[PDB]
Structures are given as structure tokens and as C-alpha cells.
Amino acid sequence: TKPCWYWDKKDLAHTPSQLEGLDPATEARYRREGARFIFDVGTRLGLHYDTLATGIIYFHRFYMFHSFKQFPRYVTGACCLFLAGKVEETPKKCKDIIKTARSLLNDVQFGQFGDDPKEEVMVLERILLQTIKFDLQVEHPYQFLLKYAKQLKGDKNKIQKLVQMAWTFVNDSLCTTLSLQWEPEIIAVAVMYLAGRLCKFEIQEWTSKPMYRRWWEQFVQDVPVDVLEDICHQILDLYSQGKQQMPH
Amino acid sequence: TESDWGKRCVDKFDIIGIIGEGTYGQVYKAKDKDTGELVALKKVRLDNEKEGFPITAIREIKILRQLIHRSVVNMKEIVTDKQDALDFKKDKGAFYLVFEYMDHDLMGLLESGLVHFSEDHIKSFMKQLMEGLEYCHKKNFLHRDIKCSNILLNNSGQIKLADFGLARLYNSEESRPYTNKVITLWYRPPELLLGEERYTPAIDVWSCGCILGELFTKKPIFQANLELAQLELISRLCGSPCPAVWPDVIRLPYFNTMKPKKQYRRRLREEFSFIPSAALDLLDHMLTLDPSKRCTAEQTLQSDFLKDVELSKMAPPDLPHWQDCHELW
Amino acid sequence: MSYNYVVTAQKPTAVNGCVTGHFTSAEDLNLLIAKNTRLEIYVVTAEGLRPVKEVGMYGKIAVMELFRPKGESKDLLFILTAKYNACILEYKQSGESIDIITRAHGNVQDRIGRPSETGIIGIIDPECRMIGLRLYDGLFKVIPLDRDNKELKAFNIRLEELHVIDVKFLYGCQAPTICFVYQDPQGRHVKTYEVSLREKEFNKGPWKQENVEAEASMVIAVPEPFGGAIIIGQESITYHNGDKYLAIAPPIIKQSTIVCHNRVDPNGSRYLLGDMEGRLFMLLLEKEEQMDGTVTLKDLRVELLGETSIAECLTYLDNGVVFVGSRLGDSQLVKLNVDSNEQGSYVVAMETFTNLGPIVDMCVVDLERQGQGQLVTCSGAFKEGSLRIIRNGQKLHIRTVPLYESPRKICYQEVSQCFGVLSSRIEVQDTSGGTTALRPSASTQALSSSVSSSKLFSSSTAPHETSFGEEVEVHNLLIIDQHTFEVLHAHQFLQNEYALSLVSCKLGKDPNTYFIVGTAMVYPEEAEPKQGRIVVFQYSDGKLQTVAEKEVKGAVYSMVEFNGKLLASINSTVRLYEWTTEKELRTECNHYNNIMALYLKTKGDFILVGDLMRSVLLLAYKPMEGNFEEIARDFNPNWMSAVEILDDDNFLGAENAFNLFVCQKDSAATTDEERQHLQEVGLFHLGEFVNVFCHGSLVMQNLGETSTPTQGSVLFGTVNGMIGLVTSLSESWYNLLLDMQNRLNKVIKSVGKIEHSFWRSFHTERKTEPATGFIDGDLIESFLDISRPKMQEVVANLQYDDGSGMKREATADDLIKVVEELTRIH
């Protein structure tokens, strides 16, 4: 019926990119840079946050089936965003995406688009659709972060700080392969979990079951605390490596 | 696996012939070589490259893979023309959206006059369409182009709804700017005629009501070629739009611009006196001018006409076929 | 775009309805006879019928009743067309000049309504207070006959009884009372209402409802001396009036269905009944007077008089003469005599009127080798079945060959100097377990005879139950000589085998000329037949030989010879068979994308398919590959009655709604999509049901005939007997003639004030469109009959174009010559 879009961390050692001689650090950084390209391009064009995420999910899934050495990441990114606009009903003309991409890319980077940028992108749409197996509908952590937060009652400012901080973590997790490891529901819980730890909040108190240390169980079933820690660790690693620090 | 769409080739289907052309590409009737199952193939041509893959097809791929109901048509898979080897750029081949094959379409049956509908027949038809429409309206999807041209029927009496090319999501909290000319004029809701542009799920209910009347008279209730002539015909039967029956009619863009000849009174019950009392009440509510007072899909299911209809009794519509092939002496 | 021309060679011969009245004057007795789109006025004399006038209308006459409102010297006539055009007409004669005055006009079509299963019913009050119309189920429409209602404005009264069988106004009521039979789940009932013009609604009727026969068919309003009504059914006749109830159930009427009633004695003492077997009965009302002086009905009696034609409507013409309005055979004038003849009959045929009847099929053959076509038509049904040979002898010469059984298809085999005809006759299950024919007919009077002994379906599973008295069809192939028209041979097909298709041709390398018949095994339970045969016969030395048989899984609706191969349509399938050197049909290639492939036509390697609901498909045989290819399909939903190929690009179709259309390849190769789209470039409402299209022309060809502007000739036959010709025009001639029509429309006075454009508009219940691509030859050929002042008025400001001169002024004399050339095509 529907395809499986989730892999194990151990499997990422065997992407096409890895087996063509690309090392783990290079692919990982390329994913952040490619994702960020999609994020920045769509932000300049004023696109809804779901549209950016859908393009990023297509992009991440794409490079589970192809190598970065044979498909320029930025062309793929532009193509993903193009399709994402039509899927999420926030359409943009391909020429405008190229226009914005040229604005944000230097001369070397825009060389990936070749002599005819629009053509290189429009051509790729065929491969993209076959690659993602025409499974266009994608859910994102954002809707669950809000659906779950709405069931929290208590100090309005404390909960809103939790939401925004978690929301920031969701945006940052788009640069990582977490989109390929865990369903969005778990991601939304994980970012709530992380924000709670950083803000020294005890989220259970705001739930309908204030004496249920496991508030996540009423939102997401069969979620071990272990999973949430692995996700938190990866998000925090991105902040530790960069100069930016936890939002707080 | 069954889920890896877009790879299997169209060679696997034996084409029987062309059965239609609309929206993006032509529809063909085919038989699967392996299983022998009849299928319908919508050719999707991306060669234009103005906007690549048609968004009308994208909507129908996205929504119909989410929607599972016996009253909504199934997309079995998507298959491809023999693709150019090692030349992904040169490749201009088209995709085929594979649907379940439905025997007939309502329009052709009514148009040829070859279909007679009894009260019981009409119930089963509407009950399924509503079961489908409700399932879709509950998932916050709007069909936005209900027509006899795309209600499909099998000889068994099974109805399925089909043309999701214009279907989009509806958010109650955040009304979104939309496209006004969404349902075809013969089945257009008054609200869209006057420029509503912020449509409710009720727009699809109005069309189904028009069909309901079309099942008793065998003719579309409101037929016109101009957006204002349609309003006149609707106004004669349902009453002229007025603040008394439609409090927010003044907010509409073209309410002052578009006025009927008179302030007609509602005559629906009189002109449809021949309709059974249970259906007449359903028509009165489905064909209500104010979208907020217009009945919902579920409410039609909870009507004296439809609630106690049984799925087990298919009640297939009668087709003379061979009997009327030869003129009757 | 495409440009075509349609002309009526023979006017409709079938009778739709009849009433008699004092239309022209109170002194004159008049019989008004109605044929589709035609009105015929006569003055009835004891010597015969004398025609006063013949009128044409832009509409199919549905309702026709004669009424004389107080203050008129003569009766007026109400007419309602099938398009719901209504009119009141009055006779006016000034010396030698006759005109028909349109006193009132209006279209009574409602925006919302369901056409009744029984159809439009029309009646007029005995006091001429109102005209009653039941146009739609559940509604009763009233046109009040007031002096001021010149527009025939009307109102609807809600009617609870949705399925109404028949209705009449009653005599002898204090307020206008309708009596009608209706059907609901509990059976059929008779009920009465009173119509209040002041209240514009129904009031309780004079007498209560009664449950009546399940197959009660007709309602009779009995005159003042008796009052009440008579109800005619299949097995019983009943009289209803308040407390009075009489029922007679003679066994003679059960044998055949009675479908017409007419009053013989003005006081109601006698009524005439006719049935589908042609028998003529008399319902006699036996009076019993009380000492009070009140005349009451004592009993009812039915007496067989003789045999007439199957009557859709009957009329007594005073003296003893009775006009029999027949839709299936020749109409007649018959006198009912007091003494029976030596055979026991009281009926002797006086006058007989040619009716080409239903033309099921026809072929054009040059019998005399005079370079002139003769049209041999399968005409009539049941006892009235006949072969009609028609030639343009100037009047049309029609020879009749009585068959006394129903003809279905006809084909000509010159090699054998004979005609092959498919026929069916009605036998009835008898006490022997077999069946017995009601009368001898062509299939039983053949010189030599044979019966199929095929073992193909013999095994079957088990025989279905048979009840005595049930009807069955027996199908035959008739071999008929082309000169004597004598039945030379009759081949009876298997039991429960319906013959649908017939061809005469050579196949492959076989030098023999064969008769090939396609049949279907019809079982009452089967919605669609699933068994059939293609049978190859050879007519040689007075005997018909079975040469080969092919078993198919369906009904062989249509077959046609295709370049030495046999093209046959079996249900949804179109199939091409090769004729092997072993004299056996062999399949080659097939096409399955059809619902029911009813009709087939071929030109070269192109095949045209007509379908029960999917309109017309253009197929092609690709010889390099040995298979069919879909060229282009008409994607508009149309129910076909017949198809024809005009030329390689234009294809002609006939709809069951009495409409004709022409589809052409879109001739634009940009996209494969456009070529695959057949586009309906021509739309035209004929008013007739076309059963058969046949290429050919009856006009004499001396090789000296001036080359007419029209090119090509397709003849068509209709169910009402009308024969017409379709021919093509150049763009220059079409525009010239079309511009002339628009000029004629303003000049010629229309009966009922009916817009000509509306009458010829393509009309279906769901859609109504203006005519396109067709020139009404009848409108054009009427230019030669309008007065000179009108002729010159028509030609004012007329310019020829696209010709030798770009702009040329037209004179009234120039057009007279042009139209006269157009009258030479038929």
C-alpha cells in the first residue's frame, strides 16, 4: 500500500553518496547546506513553513536513493521546492525559484545549474517523482507541536516559551537525517522534551494526567525515553558545533 | 513492493480504447495483462514544461491516495512509458494514472435516456455519494466540481465520485483566498456566482441537490451559459437572494452588481410537488441560498430519505439495453 | 465545418391521430387526419372523402381536439406539438383562397417537470370551458378557454396520483369533472376530480374511486343520455357512474389488446373498439328506461364485425363509413353493414390508402437496368408486413408485395435474380406443446422450405417453462424473385433465434455468392443475449444450402462485407472474419471498446461504428499489422438509430430523439488529441425516426442531367413512412441557401406562430441547441409556392459570393431557376 520512509542510523553508512567515496561528514554537511538552501530560497519567496519542510523532506529522501556526486544538491533542492509548492498549494513559477537561487548562490555554486538553469530543474522533476514513489503527502512536526501544546493548560507565558523554543528545534532538525529516522509525531514530542529540560519545566503538570511522569505516552504511544534522548543529542550536537547557542 | 509507484511500465496493460479527454490528458480503457482487471489510464503529459507535472494531477494523486471509501474512486498505481535509457533529460514520456474501471458515467445514462430511476434507486445512488462526500468533508477536502459528467456507476449499483483535479483543503479557523469559478455553471452554488471566493464545504452540497432534482426530472435543475442567467433561474425556484434569507449576502463582491429581475419568492415545493415528501424536504435544505443555513453532508445522511437505506440492497438502476435496441411495435 | 442539404422525397404516410368535427362550417361534416408534421382537412360525403386543404406545421402534433365555444359558428381546433407549441386554428375561405387563422399561440413547456410515462394527454371540456393537458407526471395543466387568452396562458394543479394511465372530461356534470385511471403499488384505480377555475385547484369528484383491471388502458366519456365512463382493459370492460357498475368480460377480447375507441351513435348507444390483430368490435349499450323516464344502462355487449387495419385511432364517418387510422399498415375507409356476407363479416373494404408503414430496412436496386434506382423497402409489421417497390415514375409509383408477417432486413443478390429478406411471424403456444400461427404468411407459403438443424446450442441446460397462450417470434430467411416477387424459399431459424443482420456477397477467393445471416439466441431472462450464430447460406437451383456456421458469444446486430472479409459486430465487439479455403469463417482482428455495437458502415479500410449510447466511432483496418485502430470517437452521449458515411471525412448519424448530426475528423494534426476528437459540426431536428440510411437516388440518370449544386445522395427511411435525401453542398452554396432561409423565415406565415428556428433546433430533454450545417430543403423548395410579391421581397439585397462574381444581385426569376434545379434531386 504505502512505502516505508524511515531508516536506522546505522543504515546511513550505506547511502549511494557514502559508497561512492563520500565520507560521513561531507554528506551530513551537504544535507544541512542543501536543506538550508531550500529553506532560504523559499523564505525569500514568502513560502509557508510546511512548503519549506515538504521540499526538505523530498530532498532528504532523494539522497537516500542517489549520490550527491551525480546530482548537484542545489539543483535538486530547487526542484524539490518547486514540486513542494504545487503539492502544498503554494505554487511558484520555476523561473522565480531560479531568480532567487541565483541571488543567494555565488558564481561557483550556481554553476551546478549549468547553461540553462530552468531546464536542469524542470527535467529533474520526473526523477524526483519516481524517486519519492509519488508519495507526496507529508506530515511535519509543526502540526503535532501545536496539537499537543493545545492540550497543555497552565502558565500561558511558560507554555509559549516552550512552543517557540521547540519550534526553533524543529526548524533546526530539518538540516539533519532525523526526518529519515523518526516519524514527525516523535519529533514534536522530542523537541517539547528538550525545551522542557532546558527551561527547567515539568510538562506533566500541564497535562490532564499531572501525576503521569510520561506525558508523551498520552500523545505518542510506544515512545521509549531512549528515543527522545537520541533525538535531543543530535539536535544539541548541531548547536555545539556551530557558534549559535541554545535559543533560551 | 506494491508501493513503489512510477516504475512499472504501461506495457503491462492492454489498451482497449480511448474513453475521454479532459483536464490534462486523455483517458484510456485497458486490461491488466497479468490479472485481467479492467483499469482506466489518465495520460499525464509533462512535455509542456511550462509548469512541469500538472498541478491538477498532483491534487488527484495526493488526495486519492489518502481517501479510502467505496464511494470514492481508487487510484491503483501510476505507470510510465518506456523511458529513455541513460538519457533522463531527453526523456519526454508520459505517466498514466491507473484507476479502477467504472462501467458508466451518470451523464451518458441520463443523456441517452436509457436509464430510469425509481425512488429506491435514487436513494442508493445518493446515499453512496453522500457517504463519499461525508467521508471527504470530514477529512477537510472539497471536491469543488460535482457534475453528472463525473459521478460514476457500475451495473451493480455501486457509485463512485471521481474528478478530484480541483480538490483542495478547507480550514475552518483560517479561511483562505480561493478560486471563484470552481463548480461548473449548471451545478454552481449561488455563493460562488456572487463572488464568494471563500467557500465552505456547502458548495458541494448544492451540486448534489441539483443532482437530486436531476434524478427525478432527469434534467439539470439550473442550466445557463451566463453567470447571471443562472442566478435568475436559481432565484425563480429558490427565491431571490435577500438579506432576510441570507444575512451576509451584502458582504459578497457582486451582490449589488448582479441582481435578478424581481425579488422572486421561493417556489421549490410547488414546482417539485411531484417529488416524494421525504426527498422534497431534502431538496429544500440542500438547495438553501445561505451556505450557513444549507444542510451538511452528514445531515443528509440523517434524513428520513437516506438514514435507513441499506448498503446490502444495492438496488441497481434499470437499463433496457437490448430490449430497446429494436424499436418497440 | 460541414454543409449538407436535407429534402423530403415522400411525406409521412402514418396516421398519428384523428377527430371529426364541424371545423369548416356547422353545415359541413369534416374528417381531419393527422400525419407527423402534416394536417389534412377533408369534407366527408357519402360518396367519399374530398380534400379541402392540407396544412404543414413546424412541430410534431401530439394533442388534437376539436371544440366549438359558444358564439362560434364552427368548431375551433387546438393543437399541441411535441415541443409543447400550442395553437388554436380557424378555417377561413374567400372564394378560391383558403387561410388558416392562428387565434391563440403559446408554448406550454414548464421549466421543471417529469415527462409522463404514458406521455402528454390532451382533452377539452364538453362545455369548452378549459383545455386539459397532462404534460408531466404529478401535474395537470389547465388552459382556460376565455376570449382574452390569446397567448394560451395556463396554470398547474398539483395532482396526487403520479402515474396516470389516461384521462377524459366527463359529460353531465355540474362542474367540470375529469375521470382518469391511475396506477400505484396497490394496482390500478379509477378516480374523479372537479376543476375549480375560481380556486384553480381540484375539488372532490362526483363519484368514488373503484379498483379496476391491472391492465386498464383507455377511459371513455359516455354522452349525456347515460353519463359516466367506460374503462377498456385486456380482459374486461367496465362502466362506472356513481352507484352504477357493470362489467362484461367476453373471451374474444382477451385474444388481442384493444388500443382504440370511437363513438358511433352520438347518444353513446354504440362505441367502436379495435385491436392489434385488426379485428373490429362494437361495444353496445343496452338501454332500460324506468317509469320515471330516467334512461339507465342495462348491460354491455361486444360483437365482432370483421377485420380492419391495426388502428392507433378510429373515426366513424357517418353513413356506414369508418376511417381506420393505422400506424403499422395501410389506412382504410370501411363501411359496417347490417347483413353479414357469406364469410360472416359485416366489414367490406371500400377505399385503401398507401402507407409505407415502418421502414425497418431498405435497399436501392436497378431492377430494369434503366439507370434508375428502385427502392425496395421492408414496410409494415405483423399482418401489414409488406415489401414496397418505389420508383420515380411525375408521381411516385409504389408496388406492394403482401407478406402478412414482419419484415426485418432486405438485401439484393443479383447473381440469383432474387431478394433475401429476414422476417418474423407470431405463433402462440397451443395445447400440443408447440405453437400455431394466427394466419398463413410468406414464411409458410414459400414454394420450397427448410429448417435449421444446427446442433450448436441444442444441449443448452434445461428448457424454460411455457404457458399456453403466450406469444413467440419465429424468424425466417425469405428468397423472393426480383420480377414476380414470389416467395421462392423460406428457411426457418432455430427456436428462440432472433435474426438481426443479413448480407449478400462473395468472400475471399470463393467464387460463390452467399447469403449470410447473423442471429442472436434470445432468452427472456437474459438482459443481453450471450449466444448467436453467423450462418452462410447458398441459394442454388431453388434450394437454400447451409454452407458453414460460426458460433459467437452474443448478438450479431450488424454485418458488412469488408474487402473480401466479413465484418460483424457481436454485442460490444466488432470482429473481422476471413473466409478460408475450407469454407469456414476465421477471426482475424477485433475491437472491444463499445457498449453495444449496433450499426456498422464501411468505406475503403475505414469502419464506422454506431453504439447504443456512445455515439459514433471511426475505426480503421491496418493491413500491414492485421488489426484495428481507433481513428476518432464522438465523445458526446447520443443514442443511435442509424449511421452512414458521407465521405472519407464526414459521417452522418441519427438520434432516437428525431435528430440528425454530422461528425467530421478535426483535420488538425498538431496534437493526436485533436484528431481523436470527432466534432459534431452539423445538428438538425428531422422530426422522424430514421431506421435505415442507404446510398443511392431514385431520379432517372440519362448521363445528360445538369450537374446539380448538390453532390452525393443518401436516402433514409423513417418509422412514419417518410423518405428523405441527404446531400452535401459547397460552402458558397450553403451560405447562399442559408441566407435565403433567414429571408424566407420572415416572409412565410407559420401556423401557430411557431419560430422555424425552434422547430429545427436540435432538441433533447437535457439540451437544446440551434440547427447548424443543414439546409431545410422543404423551406427552400417552398419559395416556388409563395406569391410573386413575397418572392421579390425575399430577394431584396441578396448578393452571390465566392463565385464568378464576388457580389451579384439576385432576381426573383434567378432563384426560381435555382430552386427548380434543387427540386430535381428527388
Ligand SMILES: Cc1nn(C)c(CNc2nc(NCc3ccc(-c4ccccn4)cc3)c3ncn(C(C)C)c3n2)c1S(N)(=O)=O
Ligand atoms: C474530465 C473527466 N472526468 N471524468 C470522471 C470523466 C469521465 N470519464 C471517465 N469515465 C469512466 N468510466 C465510465 C465510462 C466507461 C466507458 C465509456 C466508453 C466510451 C466509449 C466507448 C465505450 N465506453 C465511457 C465512460 C472512468 N473510470 C475511471 N475514470 C477515471 C477516474 C480515470 C473514468 N473517467 C471525464 S471526461 N468527460 O473527460 O470523460
